[PDB]
Amino acid sequence: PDKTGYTNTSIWVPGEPDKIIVYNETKPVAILNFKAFYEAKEGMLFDSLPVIFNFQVLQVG
Amino acid sequence: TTQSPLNSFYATGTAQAVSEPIDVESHLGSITPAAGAQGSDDIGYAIVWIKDQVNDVKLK
């Protein structure tokens, strides 16, 4: 925020300007966007099963 | 959870045949000759009504 290029600048999710992540502060952040391609099974009716993603850190520097 | 057989769809109509193909009403007359005479005379007519979607009739 104390430099020319970063005067009053925000960071938000691509394509969704109303969801601001960072505003006028130094917070290193990465945004992972998820998109699904699916084929439902024929005749199967289901209500509320979850889709679970697990993240495991391998190396850091 | 639920596995649908995808068969529970139906559409229904009706059919009927409540009338015979023809109706016959008679207006015939009489033959009144003398005993042993020879002649000819018109008797009358017979009306043959035709019913729904009937186009050709074969009678005996």
Ligand SMILES: [Ca+2]
């Ligand atoms: Ca390390």
Ligand SMILES: [Ca+2]
């Ligand atoms: Ca005779």
Ligand SMILES: [Ca+2]
């Ligand atoms: Ca005669």
Ligand SMILES: [Ca+2]
């Ligand atoms: Ca006919």
